[model samples]
Target: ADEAIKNGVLDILADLTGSDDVKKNLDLNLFETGLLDSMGTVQLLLELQSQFGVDAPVSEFDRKEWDTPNKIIAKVEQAQ
Candidate 1:
């Protein structure tokens, strides 16, 4: 059940980051790579809500907590 959600989150991240590399480097810092910024984070939150019913508002977003793909997946999973 969560596996599908995990893969969906990965897919969204790949599309947002514009790189299949995200799937390979689960620990890659999206911020450090400049693949994600404040605007991108808002978009990510929106995507999670629209795609998975995960309601993470931008106001609650923490850089460290959501910095990597794996972490993001875990967060989404936890929300579910």
Candidate 2:
């Protein structure tokens, strides 16, 4: 059911971070795993907002709030 959201985020992260490892671990901490950085977060936010119409304002873009694909998709659904 949430495959699109998963793929969308994975695609962007894979492209942005130049690593396909994101596809391997949906539950891993992207930041802690070094799969994502501050810039990666910005790219993620932009991609979600533009591709999925998710209102990912920086005010609510916390590491604890969106550190994985599942959390990100939830946030996207809620913002939309």
Candidate 3:
């Protein structure tokens, strides 16, 4: 269900940030804190494809649309 997608997105974020500290703040903006830059976004897109099978090409990836774990979840769910 959607919960699985949300947890998977959070897991990806925690792994990328090198800590589960993000779990304490679900709405923390990954981009606003400079935690996710261009390369990181590329890696995240790849990870999302590998983890959830979402085929989001770089041309379609937008920071505003996928700014946080929750937004990522929404995009992933929509992609499906």
| Clash number by candidate, in order | 0, 0, 0
The list of candidate 1 runs beyond 4 A from truth reads none
lDDT of each: 0.81, 0.71, 0.73
TM-score of every prediction relative to native? 0.86, 0.75, 0.77
Residue range with the least summed lDDT across 10 consecutive positions in model 3: 18-27
Question: Candidate 1 or 3, higher lDDT?
Answer: 1
Give a tens-digit lDDT track for model 1, residues 1-80. 45778887888888888887787889888889888877777787787887677877677657876889998888898887
Please give, for residues 1-80, the per-residue lDDT of candidate 3 as tens digits. 56767787788787787666666676677778677666776777787887677887676567776667777777888887
**Winner by lDDT:** 1
Query: Once model 1 is optimally superposed onto the true structure by TM-score, how far is the C-alpha of residue 64 displaced, in angstroms?
Result: 0.9
Q: What lDDT would candidate 1 get against the real structure?
A: 0.81
lDDT of 2 by residue, 1-78 (tens): 366766777777667668777666666677777877677778788878787867676755577666776676567767
